[PDB]
Amino acid sequence: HMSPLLFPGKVTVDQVTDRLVIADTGHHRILVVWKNGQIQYSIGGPNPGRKDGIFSESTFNSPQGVAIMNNIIYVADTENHLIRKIDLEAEKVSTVAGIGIQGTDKEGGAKGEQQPISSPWDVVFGTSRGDILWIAMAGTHQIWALLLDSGKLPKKNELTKGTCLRFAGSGNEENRNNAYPHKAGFAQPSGLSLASEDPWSCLFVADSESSTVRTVSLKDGAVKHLVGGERDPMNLFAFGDVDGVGINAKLQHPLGVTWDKKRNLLYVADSYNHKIKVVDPKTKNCTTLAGTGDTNNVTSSSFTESTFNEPGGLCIGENGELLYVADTNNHQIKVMDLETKMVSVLPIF
């Protein structure tokens, strides 16, 4: 109980300042820290709530996904079933989607606080300038979008700012890929990462209950298998810990993905296996990058001898030099140096 963090589920990196944003999930607060670990903002706490307003009165409820661009942070405020907006310039928290209770709507289409949502778990910025917030909607097994400005989703017509709706996923809890996004099926999708550039042009999805990684095309929304699971779209009992190509790889409840555009590699928080995996989206090869699989925590080690404990999220740093891991059940951000192949613990001060 001595770490300043408690079960931190997610971490992201600000691309223009190199700051980190940490969802300190168990303390119901969001941290903004400089890359050396010095805290700049602590927003929320100590108890769960859904209060908006100035920073000192704002509260969250077991938040997960965090995304930052241009001094605005969006929060998958999971247990409130809300998307929240932290405006660092104005030092105000606001609510931009959800009604504060768990929705069952598998389609969406309403604006903002008129639209019920269900256990949002991860968020990333996209571009139809950062005018889309993509949402891993774990509660209804779907990928959703919030329009931050008016714009068009892939193959759709323009929708007004604030529209919040399903993009991919039927709503059935399945491991189902499809040429048409509404006919695909996900199973507790919990991690997203954007690869907007050719030849990828996709969102990568950590599909936790199917133990797979999928791609969702930003050209036409086609949902495709990348690694893990089995062919049967109803089989959610297809987990394990196996390095291999495509369908031969086995994951266990992966909660996070992050795209490394420098190396054209995808890193995966393979949470229940206590490992970080690396996927080459070309060869579809999934191999172990770091983690022995045991949960005896060591604070300094090589990649191969490092340990994690259900890491809930991760994010590549600027220019792909460092990989930050929300090492959830160790209450730490682990810093993986991709040049020295060493793992350390981010100090928080």
Numbering used by the authors: 219 to 346, 352 to 572
Task: Copy the relevant paper text.
The six-bladed β-propeller domain comprises six NHL repeats, a structural motif originally identified in genes NCL-1, HT2A and LIN-41 and shown to often function as a protein-protein interaction module.
The crystal structure of the β-propeller domain was solved by single-wavelength anomalous dispersion method using selenomethionine substituted protein. The crystals of native β-propeller domain diffracted to 1.75 Å, belong to a space group P21 and contain one molecule of the β-propeller in the asymmetric unit. Given the high resolution of the data, the electron density for the main-chain is complete and side chain residues are clearly visible, except for a short fragment between residues 346 and 352 where the electron density is missing. In contrast to other β-propeller proteins, the NHLRC2 β-propeller is not closed by a so called ‘Velcro strap’ which is the insertion of the first N-terminal β-strand into the last propeller blade framework. Instead, N- and C-terminal β-strands even though located in close proximity to each other, belong to separate β-propeller blades. The central pore of the β-propeller domain of NHLRC2 is approximately 12 Å in diameter and contains a number of water molecules. No electron density corresponding to metal ions were observed in the NHLRC2 β-propeller structure and structure-based alignment does not reveal any relevant residues which might participate in a catalytic reaction.
